[PDB]
Design a binder for this molecule. Sequence first.
Ligand SMILES: Nc1nc2c([nH]c(=O)n2[C@H]2C[C@H](O)[C@@H](COP(=O)(O)O)O2)c(=O)[nH]1
Ligand SMILES: OC[C@H]1O[C@@](CO)(O[C@H]2O[C@H](CO)[C@@H](O)[C@H](O)[C@H]2O)[C@@H](O)[C@@H]1O
Ligand SMILES: [Mn+2]
Ligand code: NA
Length: 129
Amino acid sequence: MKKLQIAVGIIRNENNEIFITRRAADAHMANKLEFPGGKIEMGETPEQAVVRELQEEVGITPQHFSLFEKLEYEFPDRHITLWFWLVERWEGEPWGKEGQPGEWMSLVGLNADDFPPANEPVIAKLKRL
Ligand SMILES: Nc1nc2c([nH]c(=O)n2[C@H]2C[C@H](O)[C@@H](COP(=O)(O)O)O2)c(=O)[nH]1
Ligand SMILES: OC[C@H]1O[C@@](CO)(O[C@H]2O[C@H](CO)[C@@H](O)[C@H](O)[C@H]2O)[C@@H](O)[C@@H]1O
Ligand SMILES: [Mn+2]
Ligand code: NA
């Protein structure tokens, strides 16, 4: 079974809103809401991966960020380790840089059912802030 390390960024603005994108219909976890992110490549660190992934996916450079949560999840056909970084400072303005839907969502209104099930404890913990 495939094993992956994934780095994602929880992009939070001053109004307690999070920048959320929607996954493609033909991707793993198709049509789900997501924190922007992707696979940590060989020769790069988890911190370097979340910077690169957010630059690629939404056109911002995160800075002075923190590890909010790290967890493992076994999907039906793959095992992933997710690194959730809390990003509250960045250069740039996030947008759908890869043509994907993106928008700001109030933290209090997030529905964990809209996200991959691996995100359940993270969305709960975010609402605890
Ligand atoms: N990008 C991203 N991927 C997630 C999240 N939650 C989650 O289980 N995943 C899974 C879906 C994919 O199997 C993998 C990410 O790989 P890609 O972003 O390259 O598709 O991690 C999330 O919040 N953001
Ligand atoms: O691991 C993140 C953690 O480390 C601190 C320093 O104690 O931040 C450092 O690492 C971040 C991720 O690379 C950088 O963004 C930051 O500039 C650097 O100081 C903590 O602030 C953070 O919780
Ligand atoms: Mn991705
Ligand atoms: Na990506």
